[PDB]
Amino acid sequence: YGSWEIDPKDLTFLKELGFGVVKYGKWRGQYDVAIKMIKEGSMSEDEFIEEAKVMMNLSHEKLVQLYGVCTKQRPIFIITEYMANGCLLNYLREMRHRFQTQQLLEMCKDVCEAMEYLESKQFLHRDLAARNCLVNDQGVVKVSDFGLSRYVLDDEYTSSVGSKFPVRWSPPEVLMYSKFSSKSDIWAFGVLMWEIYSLGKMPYERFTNSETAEHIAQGLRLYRPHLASEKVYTIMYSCWHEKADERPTFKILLSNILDVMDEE
Ligand SMILES: Nc1ncnc2c1c(-c1ccc(Oc3ccccc3)cc1)cn2C1CCCC1
């Protein structure tokens, strides 16, 4: 076993949590883990395994921690930090939480910290969205599935023509030219802020993907969620400059979010 490789015999599977299936379990009988099981034919496995070595060296409190992989048998496993409150999107949609806006801004800050870290490592997420963030037992949001889209074999998800592509989280230059950059992550982050302040509404709710792409190409934008103050709206909106070079960095976004927290 290499440093990136976990012995699957050290795993105990306890419950199904919901590419494939994800389970909750224990490592060596004691420590909580999530086990993401990768279905046959779904992934470029050799490429993922090499990238896993890079992903192992990423470490930040607001990034879901990759403990290792199991790849000597199939389906291959991705072993990670267990996030008790599950997917951010589902969490947002649970109206019982009765969120204060302070809580929503903190979720934004959690994600922005992770993204500033990824940016500092020149690591693109490539599919940032509420559905790809997780929430722990303390209500902390962490970024997940970072870079994983690179290894998906289903073409419907691979390009902007595809029926599974994240059109609603994509800047004009991605939709038109497939130009990915730090600034396409920035765009996606703004959409994620919008999802958070909208309590999990689908971006461009009333539009198809086709219509959304048209909307975007015409320079139209999401508008202010009811729960977003003018200051918060200014921050998400800054992520959507037509010109990619005019969009902020995650460092700048983080400073702006901190400022709003201080001003309340
Ligand atoms: N870690 C998790 N803890 C709790 N629930 C989880 C996960 C994960 C999870 C586990 C592993 C995983 O693997 C990676 C993590 C980071 C980077 C790349 C892969 C991604 C998500 C998913 N789920 C749920 C959300 C909706 C239904 C399933």
Swiss-Prot record:
Disulfide feature: none
Effect ascribed to mutating residue 17 to P: In XLA; moderate
Phenotypic consequence of residue 127 to H: In XLA; severe
Residues binding ATP, per UniProt: 17-22, 36
Consequence the record notes for mutating residue 223 to E: Defective in mediating calcium response
Written domain comment of the UniProt record: The PH domain mediates the binding to inositol polyphosphate and phosphoinositides, leading to its targeting to the plasma membrane. It is extended in the BTK kinase family by a region designated the TH (Tec homology) domain, which consists of about 80 residues preceding the SH3 domain.
Identification of the protein by name: Tyrosine-protein kinase BTK
Organism: Homo sapiens (Human)
Chain's gene name: BTK
